C-alpha cells in the first residue's frame, strides 16, 4: 500500500504478539516491524506469531 493504516485490529495485534511468552525478543520485534510495514497483514502475522509461540513451548 502507498499509505499504511494502523487500524484497531493492527494495534491490538501489536499487543497480542508482543505478549506471546515463548517468542524471543528478536522475533517479537521482527513481527512488530512487519506489522508496521504492512498493517493490512495483521491477522496473518498474528496467526504466524501464535504458531511460532506454540512450536517454541518450553519443555
Amino acid at each position: 500500500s502507498v499509505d499504511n493504516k494502523f487500524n484497531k485490529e493492527m494495534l491490538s495485534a501489536r499487543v497480542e504478539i508482543y505478549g506471546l511468552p515463548n517468542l524471543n525478543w528478536g522475533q517479537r520485534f521482527a513481527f512488530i516491524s512487519s506489522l508496521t510495514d504492512d498493517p493490512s497483514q495483521s491477522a496473518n502475522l498474528l496467526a504466524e506469531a501464535k504458531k511460532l509461540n506454540d512450536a517454541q513451548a518450553p519443555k
Binding site: 494502523f6 494495534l11 499487543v15 512488530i32 508496521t36 510495514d37
Partner: protein, 144 residues
C-alpha cells in the same frame, strides 16, 4: 490506547528499525505520547525528526545523524516541539540494540524533557539517568 507491555514502561522513549524505510518508529512509550502530544497511530512508521522545529540547532541534528550512520550511541541536548508547537529542551540519548553477535538490530532513543538547557551537575545527573533508562529498556526487552 493499546500499548505493548514494553511501551508501558514509565519513561519517554521510542525504538526505531533502521532496516525499514527512513529508520522509523516501531515502538513509542505512553509517556512519550503524553510528552509530545502525538498519537501512536500518527507516528508508527515515521522518523522521529518531526520533533524538531525552526529553532533546533542543525549542527546538533547532524551529530545525531553521524552517530546513527556510525551505528553508535550519542547524547545531545536540543530543542524539540510538541504537536501543538510548544518548545521543550530534550536531553536525548540514542543507543543501538545489538544481538549476541554484536550487530545492530534497532535503536532506542530516550528523551528527558526540561524547560531549560541543563549544565554542570544537572546535566551529568540527566545524562546518567537517560543512559540507565536506555539500558533498562534494552534489559526489559531481552529478559527471559
Amino acid at each position: 490506547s493499546l500499548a505493548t507491555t514494553l511501551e508501558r514502561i514509565e519513561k519517554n522513549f521510542v525504538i526505531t528499525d533502521p532496516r525499514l524505510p527512513d529508520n522509523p518508529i516501531i515502538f513509542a512509550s505512553d509517556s512519550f505520547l503524553q510528552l509530545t502530544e502525538y498519537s501512536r497511530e500518527e507516528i508508527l512508521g515515521r522518523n522521529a525528526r518531526f520533533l524538531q522545529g525552526p529553532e533546533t540547532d542543525r549542527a546538533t541534528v547532524r551529530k545525531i545523524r553521524d552517530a546513527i550512520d556510525n551505528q553508535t550511541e550519542v547524547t545531545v541536548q536540543l530543542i524539540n516541539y510538541t504537536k501543538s508547537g510548544k518548545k521543550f529542551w530534550n536531553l536525548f540519548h540514542l543507543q543501538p540494540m545489538r544481538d549476541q553477535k554484536g550487530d545492530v538490530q534497532y535503536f532506542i532513543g530516550v528523551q528527558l524533557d526540561g524547560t531549560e538547557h541543563v549544565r554542570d551537575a544537572a546535566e551529568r545527573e540527566g545524562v546518567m539517568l537517560i543512559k540507565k533508562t536506555a539500558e533498562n529498556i534494552d534489559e526489559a526487552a531481552k529478559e527471559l
